[PDB]
Amino acid sequence: HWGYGKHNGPEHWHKDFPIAKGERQSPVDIDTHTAKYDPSLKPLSVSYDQATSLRILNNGHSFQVTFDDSQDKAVLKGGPLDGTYRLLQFHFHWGSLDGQGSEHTVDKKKYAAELHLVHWNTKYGDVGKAVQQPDGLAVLGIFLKVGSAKPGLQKVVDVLDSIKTEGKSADFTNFDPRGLLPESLDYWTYPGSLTTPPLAECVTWIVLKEPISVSSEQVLKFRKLNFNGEGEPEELMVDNWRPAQPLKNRQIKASFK
Numbered sequence: 108h109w110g111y112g113k114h115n116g117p118e119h120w121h122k123d124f125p126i127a128k129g130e131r132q133s134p135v136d137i138d139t140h141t142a143k144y145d146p147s148l149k150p151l152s153v154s155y156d157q158a159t160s161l162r163i164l165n166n167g168h169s170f171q172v173t174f175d176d177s178q179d180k181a182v183l184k185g186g187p188l189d190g191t192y193r194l195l196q197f198h199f200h201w202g203s204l205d206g207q208g209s210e211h212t213v214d215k216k217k218y219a220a221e222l223h224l225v226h227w228n229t230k231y232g233d234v235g236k237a238v239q240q241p242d243g244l245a246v247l248g249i250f251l252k253v254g255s256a257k258p259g260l261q262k263v264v265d266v267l268d269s270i271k272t273e274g275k276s277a278d279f280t281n282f283d284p285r286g287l288l289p290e291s292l293d294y295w296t297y298p299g300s301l302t303t304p305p306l307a308e309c310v311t312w313i314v315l316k317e318p319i320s321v322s323s324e325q326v327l328k329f330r331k332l333n334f335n336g337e338g339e340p341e342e343l344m345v346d347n348w349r350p351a352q353p354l355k356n357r358q359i360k361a362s363f364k
């Protein structure tokens with residue numbers, strides 16, 4: 108199956124998932140000089156005070172923290188969105204070196220990692236239905252640069268030892284995702300897709316302008332995770348990012364001048 112290697116990586120995905128060559132694939136390069144300021148865009152509304160994290164999991168291509176989405180506890184609204192979107196999970200993409208790792212780029216600049224907070228539109232009732240809809244998901248994308256440590260990230264970093272290999276999971280309660288947000292909520296937005304298979308074109312992307320800083324010691328801990336399952340040959344989980352895709356007939360809008 109698919110992965111990020113030489114023989115099963117992103118350039119191969121179209122063979123099993125033909126939508127990989129589709130009209131609204133993600134990620135994309137954000138050209139800051141051709142993005143259009145849109146004054147009709149609302150501020151983002153992020154209501155994460157009641158979030159309930161459940162588990163942390165190595166799924167073989169990333170690690171993810173899952174949330175209880177059986178009620179409107181942690182929701183995203185406003186911005187370009189109509190309706191209420193519930194937080195399902197967050198995960199990261201990162202590189203083998205500090206100069207790469209993000210999926211989106213800004214004027215071709217790559218960041219060391221990218222945080223994705225995945226939300227789904229409650230009018231479709233469950234996330235499985237939402238992924239079949241052009242406005243089913245909203246993913247909030249946050250860039251990571253290497254510099255000062257991010258204290259709100261350390262609890263994630265400290266548990267990664269216990270989910271080193273594919274399929275391992277651990278309890279991960281009482282994590283507050285508000286500790287991961289930058290100071291500003293200025294954003295770009297464009298209609299896009301999931302960046303791993305099934306690559307469905309169901310995502311409103313909201314990409315924040317302001318990156319968060321994390322320390323070299325925090326990101327090095329990401330790079331010690333494993334693609335393989337326990338007892339298999341050891342392949343470090345690095346460079347789990349899809350390269351930028353053609354923008355085609357799409358405009359990127361900015362919430363800020």
Ligand SMILES: C[C@]12CCc3c(ccc4cc(OS(N)(=O)=O)ccc34)[C@H]1CC[C@@H]2OS(N)(=O)=O
Pocket residue numbers: 223225234235238246300301302303304305
């Ligand atoms: C498990 C699923 C398929 C994949 C998937 C899902 C959710 C969020 C995802 C985020 C991803 O990453 S990203 N960079 O934000 O786009 C990549 C894949 C994602 C669910 C949605 C229901 C599918 O399950 S299913 N087909 O109904 O059985």
Ligand SMILES: [Zn+2]
Pocket residue numbers: 198199200223302
């Ligand atoms: Zn992602």
